[PDB]
Amino acid sequence: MISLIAALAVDRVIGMENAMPWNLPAELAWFKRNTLDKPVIMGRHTWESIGRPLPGRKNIILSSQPGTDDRVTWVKSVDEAIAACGDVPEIMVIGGGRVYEQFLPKAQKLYLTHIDAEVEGDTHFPDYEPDDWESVFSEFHDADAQNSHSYCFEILERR
Amino acid sequence: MISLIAALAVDRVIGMENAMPWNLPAELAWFKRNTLDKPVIMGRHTWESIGRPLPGRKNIILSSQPGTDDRVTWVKSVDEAIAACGDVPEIMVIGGGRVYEQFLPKAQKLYLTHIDAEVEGDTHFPDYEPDDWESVFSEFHDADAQNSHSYCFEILERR
Ligand SMILES: CN(Cc1cnc2nc(N)nc(N)c2n1)c1ccc(C(=O)N[C@@H](CCC(=O)O)C(=O)O)cc1
Ligand SMILES: CN(Cc1cnc2nc(N)nc(N)c2n1)c1ccc(C(=O)N[C@@H](CCC(=O)O)C(=O)O)cc1
Ligand SMILES: [Ca+2]
Ligand SMILES: [Cl-]
Ligand SMILES: [Cl-]
Incomplete structure (x- = not known):
C-alpha cells in the first residue's frame, strides 16, 4: 500500500522558500x-533539502531531470517509482507538494504531524476530505527544552 | 580571558526554557x-536543551540544585566555575540569561549571532554599551534551503 508522511503547519503549509522555522x-x-x-519516494527539491540519502x-527520487547522485535511484514517473519499490508491504511518500498530489489518490494512510506554527507558505499539503479518512491515532505534545513548537502526531486510514 | 557566545533574535531576545523557533x-x-x-560554562536550562555533554x-554547569549527571562538572558559584576551568587562554560562557548577566562584567569578548527572527520573549541578552566594545568582525548570511533565517556573526572586544 502507499502512505504519505508529512509535517504540516497551520493551513496545511509544508514548505517555504527557505528551511522551515522550527527545531x-x-x-x-x-x-x-x-x-x-x-522505500521512500521524494521529489528533487526535498532531496536537495535533506542533503544526503x-x-x-x-x-527513490522522482524527477524529470537527470540523476546527480549514484547513491539513490532516479525515476521519471509515478509508475516507475512504484516498480522500483519491489514487493514491500508499504511505500512511504515523503514530499513535496507536487509529489503528494500525484500519490494522494492511491494512498491508503496518512502519517501527519500538525505543528502549531503560523507561516506564509510556498507549498501546501493537498486538501483532503476529512469524511474520507479515519483518525486511528493521535498524540499531542507541547514545545519543550528541545522542541520549539507544540505538535500532534496523527495517523489516518482511508475509509 | 572570558568570552560570552550567544544567538540573539530581534531586540536581543534569547531562549528561556523552550527551544528557539529557528533551524x-x-x-x-x-x-x-x-x-x-x-571549557564551556552554562546554566541548567541550557544544559537540558543540549541534552548531553x-x-x-x-x-561546567552553574546551578544551585544538584548534579544529576557525572559526565560534567556541577558548580554552585561563579568563582567555582572559573576555578574549574584551570588555566586556559579562553573560557566560553554559553548561557542562559542569568549566566550571561553574571559573567558580562568579567568578559573581554563577545561572539554574537544576530538572527532576523521576531520571537516573543521575557529574556534578553544583557544590555552592552557597544562604546565599551569595539565591533571587530561582522559577516552576514542569507537564509537558504537548510537555514531558516538570515543571520549575522559579530565579534566585539572590550575597550
Ligand atoms: C528536510 N527534510 C524533509 C522532511 C522533514 N520532516 C518531515 N517530517 C514529517 N513528518 N514528514 C516528512 N515528509 C518530513 N520531511 C528532512 C531533513 C532531515 C531529515 C533527517 O535528518 N532525518 C533523520 C532523523 C533525524 C537525525 O538523524 O538528525 C532520519 O534518519 O530520518 C529528514 C527529513
Ligand atoms: C541549545 N543549545 C544552546 C545554544 C545553541 N546555539 C548557540 N549559538 C550560539 N551562537 N551561542 C550559544 N551560546 C548557543 N547555545 C545547543 C544545542 C545543541 C548544540 C549542539 O549540538 N552542538 C554540536 C554541533 C551540532 C551537532 O553536531 O549536533 C557541537 O558540537 O557544538 C549546541 C548548543
Ligand atoms: Ca478514531
Ligand atoms: Cl520535492
Ligand atoms: Cl540556563
Missing part, C-alpha cells in the same frame, strides 16, 4: 521511526 | 568551531 527533533524521530526499512531506507 | 545548522557550526577544545569541551 523539532521529536518530530524527526517520529519520521525516522515510521520510514525506517521502507536517508540511512537504512531505499531512497 | 540554523550553519549557526551551530559556528558555535562548535568557536567552543571546541575550550558537548564533545571535545569541558562542560
